Amino acid sequence: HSQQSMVDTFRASLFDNQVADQQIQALPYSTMYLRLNEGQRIFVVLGYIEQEQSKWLSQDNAMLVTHNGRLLKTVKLNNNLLEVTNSGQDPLRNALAIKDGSRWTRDILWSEDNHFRSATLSSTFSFAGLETLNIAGRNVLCNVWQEEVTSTRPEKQWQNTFWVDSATGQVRQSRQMLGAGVIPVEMTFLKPAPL
Amino acid sequence: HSQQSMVDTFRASLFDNQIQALPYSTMYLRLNEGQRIFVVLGYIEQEQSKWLSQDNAMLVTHNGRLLKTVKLNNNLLEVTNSGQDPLRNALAIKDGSRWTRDILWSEDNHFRSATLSSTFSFAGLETLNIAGRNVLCNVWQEEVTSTRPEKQWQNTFWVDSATGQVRQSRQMLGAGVIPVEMTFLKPA
């Protein structure tokens, strides 16, 4: 037997009746532009939130789990992020209160070619300045934060970038790896949050 | 900073202020044998069905089995060994099936817990009339017993004879307490 949920029904309709710059601002719910491996941009919608975790759904019904631009888990993709520990200590949890020099240590678990990998990541946030981004035809002033990350065994280091709304703290754009310095992910959050 | 999810929008469209015949699964919910409440299926994850109810309430189930509740007066916080519940394969159920698990719920702001043991026993064939459509079901009675304090009760589940899907269930939110009646309406 099979049931029909509202999320599936209205999600299908969205992709069956579709991006228009005016239609984006007309969508009542949050949406995002996803880019994997510098690949092609795909449209994702925010289906629901559980324990401060935002679950975004694509057309192929793949799922992305995040918290204020930070990627915490993925489902139904070629390669998936399986876990991120000590996520409650991520500075992005209070993006406006991030001080230059913020640090964070956690471990991640991700699959690569159906093989499980993991590593210990330590990073520091560095204020890169102010920047205005145009998203869905609107301007947004962002505090640009550059996260210098270093993992070990093997020793690797890369940089993630997070564009924060200087008034709400909401991340409007982010660039990060899905694993330890591997599988770049780009996300642009279209629906702006008010004060 | 806040976000707008599709569930938030569905809620604003249905409960934000006080229908029928919709393109998705729905359900008639009845608590403590009170008034019938209209519930809808919001989404599914990990084989769990998350229903949406008024006042930001939520009910999680799996083929007729209540597995959790949110934002209600008294909530079912957890049920273990769910993958072993016979309802998982309602058609493969023989008169005398058993199941053991622990439940966690909250009564009048107090948190309680208990280990449950039950056995299924056939109660006869029955035709249910749901949404003007007849449906032949295998009525399954479930004798559940616990201890400290000792207590037992009966759960009744209506399994579609051919589909194996529960279309109506009657059970307790907690140990022998808080009756929950659910009638599942197909999308059509």
UniProtKB/Swiss-Prot annotation, chain A:
Cross-referenced PROSITE patterns: PROKAR_LIPOPROTEIN
Tagged with keyword Membrane: yes
Top-rank lineage group of the source organism: Bacteria
This protein's UniProt keywords: Cell membrane, Lipoprotein, Membrane, Palmitate, Signal
Keyword check for Nucleotidyltransferase: no
Cellular component GO terms, alphabetical: plasma membrane
Topology versus the membrane: Lipid-anchor
Localisation per UniProt entry: Cell membrane
Similarity section: To E.coli YjbF.
Protein name (Swiss-Prot/TrEMBL): Uncharacterized lipoprotein GfcB
UniProtKB/Swiss-Prot annotation, chain B:
Localization in the cell: Cell membrane
Keyword Cell inner membrane annotated: no
GO CC term (a single one): plasma membrane
Domain of life: Bacteria
Membrane topology note: Lipid-anchor
Entry-linked InterPro entries: GfcB, YmcC_sf
SUPFAM superfamilies in alphabetical order: YmcC-like (SSF159270)
Keyword annotations of the record: Cell membrane, Lipoprotein, Membrane, Palmitate, Signal
Family membership: To E.coli YjbF.
The protein's name: Uncharacterized lipoprotein GfcB
Species name: Escherichia coli (strain K12)
